[PDB]
Ligand binder design. Sequence first.
Ligand SMILES: N=CN[C@@H](CC(=O)O)C(=O)O
Ligand SMILES: N=CN[C@@H](CC(=O)O)C(=O)O
Ligand SMILES: [Zn+2]
Ligand SMILES: [Zn+2]
Lengths: 450, 451
Amino acid sequence: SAIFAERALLPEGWARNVRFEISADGVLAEIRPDANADGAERLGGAVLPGMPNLHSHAFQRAMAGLAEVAGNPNDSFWTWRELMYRMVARLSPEQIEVIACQLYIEMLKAGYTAVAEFHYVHHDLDGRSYADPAELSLRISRAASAAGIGLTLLPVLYSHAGFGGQPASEGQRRFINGSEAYLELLQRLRAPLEAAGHSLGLCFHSLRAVTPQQIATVLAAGHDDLPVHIHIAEQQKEVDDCQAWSGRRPLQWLYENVAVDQRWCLVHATHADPAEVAAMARSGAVAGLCLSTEANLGDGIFPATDFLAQGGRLGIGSDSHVSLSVVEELRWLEYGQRLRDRKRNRLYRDDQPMIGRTLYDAALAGGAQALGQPIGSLAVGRRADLLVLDGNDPYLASAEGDALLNRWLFAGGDRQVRDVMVAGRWVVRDGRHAGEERSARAFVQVLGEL
Amino acid sequence: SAIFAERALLPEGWARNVRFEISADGVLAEIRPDANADGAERLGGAVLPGMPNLHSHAFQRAMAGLAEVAGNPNDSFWTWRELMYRMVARLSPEQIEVIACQLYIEMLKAGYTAVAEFHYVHHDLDGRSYADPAELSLRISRAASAAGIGLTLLPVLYSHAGFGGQPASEGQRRFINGSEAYLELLQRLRAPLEAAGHSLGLCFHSLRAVTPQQIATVLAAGHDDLPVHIHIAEQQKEVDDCQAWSGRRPLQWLYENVAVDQRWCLVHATHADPAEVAAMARSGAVAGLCLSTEANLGDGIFPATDFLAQGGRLGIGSDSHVSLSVVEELRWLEYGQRLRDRKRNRLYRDDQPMIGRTLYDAALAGGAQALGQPIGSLAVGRRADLLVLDGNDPYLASAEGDALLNRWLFAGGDRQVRDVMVAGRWVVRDGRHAGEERSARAFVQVLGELL
Ligand SMILES: N=CN[C@@H](CC(=O)O)C(=O)O
Ligand SMILES: N=CN[C@@H](CC(=O)O)C(=O)O
Ligand SMILES: [Zn+2]
Ligand SMILES: [Zn+2]
């Protein structure tokens, strides 16, 4: 089928009167600027590539905002995690699926067209495996199918409570697999994920949760085409503990011991010294920045200006899902750099002075790379994932090109996203998703159960 | 008239089945918890007092988001300011009113029910006064009335380009009044403002823009019942320059030379050292925190936890209007403290662990004080200014009490605000303002004219 955009952000920049042909399998087949609409569906506003969400723990949306209660004069990431543990202890397979489906609907409405699910809840309530060990992974895939969002599933290897292979704690029992069970899970998942059109990646929870020898095992297992994700250097405590264990910082240790490259997504990477920042940018790995969660958890501020100046690659994730907003993540990525430096206009390129466009270009590319999917740009052969902004909005209607990105990302909000397409299929129209009522009804029931 | 809420945040806390009686003049006449909804409008979700917006420069909304372009390797507040000066040089009285009306509609949709307009654009393009010196102030009052938002107009005394009574620059010419002209402007405004149900306050632009003697003149002029607002200590450069001028920091200087009290709103106050924070808290002045604008301009992070812990009073303002969101300001107020300390759950009270409720309670109280209006709480004798959240939203519907505030402020957004009432009149219903279509058409045309 064909769609027609008066304005669209193409790989070479903004274009006018672009007619897109989309094949039956949801792939961009033809892109012609300066064309006639000729029968094609005339879109209602400016068209951009959809934004990949490169980091998600779906079930956490259920408790989003609920952990904002002072129980200590020094509440932190670590007291929060205790609360997150107590909540994950109670989740049934059915509740996990309902929460995921609801979350993916909200993601779509925000302009996220594909998600990397960093999925570590594997087993039953007492830590025993389900009859089908892939139970919860399969439910995540079905939820994504139900919402219609792109999906890279990252089943997570989690084995230990801390550096040096500390025994897993009771709070972590639903997460735990040895390497053999983990590799078997990856194998079980190939057939169903392939049928769904969904993607797969390798994933270590963190250097706290797996041993160096386990990393070696998984990396030698022959899945050499898959993305590799890991939480790293999010909290100073992890840095300190790594130092006491190895005499190295986390990112420093990773680069000394593992052949980190473009396959890799380093989630957070918050506490990266100048040498670590340099190593990251050189490697072509993607920094997975989750700005709203990092602020919510008091993680700190990433050295994004230094990283970007050295050619670093990044993308955004909603992580704990306290925020589901492309606008908020990109805006406060920039604003955090401004608050630190006490200056404006921090994240731009030598060839691109526009801040919004710099942020959007970056997150699109990093996100696509991290998910391992053919997305993040409107070019022939890429998947037809896109969003349509509000053409009747006075700020956007009066703006042109990159000025329009600035109006949206810095002066506007989520409501300016009106229509959302994933793999050639309209999943949000005029702010509405066809599954929203049914999902909200099931979701509110689950919230009551929790 | 009468409305009925299944849940409402009253001054004593959350209550159920609250019937509100509203007088003909839009004042809360009776508030009855655990009542029935007979002959009263059944409200569609949780009811909260409306949020005062304690600091606004309306015209800046027209340029919001457009100054996000690297022009230098390390862009400054002062390069932005020159950019703002460039648009102000073009604004007509009509454009001013149209921008303000549109802005105030958007504010209402976000849950802001009253605004303090920190208004310093006074004169014609060449710096000469309009035939009616109050022309542009009156335009602001007329726009607030068209939107239906509560208004405290703060005409700004602006006389100088810098400490020590430096001559004002050409770019500042539309702002400039001497003390006597400013005081006459205040007198001219009293009748039309009261006729519209609007309030007035005293306002000095900053310590850079007025002299100590001008401050003394204005404060001695007999308007002892009005709020007093001032931009202070926003940028490190102002701190450095004040120090070079007086041997004192800006807040330190103000407290040493002026009787600062509960009438005062100190806008930004970002660079406050420990002694200055203590003096602010002890004085009962309101800190006017404009979080989105402060982040956008790279001002820095206010010591909100230290200030709050000592009994400090605060409220929020949208300032340059890059953001129009009660959610965003309160959320990033807390989050800024989290990023600085690398800890969670920062702004709480000894008697209130709930972060959302701590933030809302504080901003309501400080906002109301700073505006000098009878707002900020649902109590008999206060104005019927309120918002209704979305009762169909699954996050809110499944929450009770302060948990509901946490879901909204930390996990939700502006769209959860559905209905908004100011002075007993519905001005937003189901997310829609009746004047939005007319306003947007005039507004988009003005944007075309300016840009
Ligand atoms: N924001 C971090 N969340 C992590 C916590 C961890 O790294 O242990 C997690 O959900 O597993
Ligand atoms: N955020 C700063 N705005 C101020 C600038 C100033 O203090 O000169 C203003 O609009 O007057
Ligand atoms: Zn994570
Ligand atoms: Zn201001």
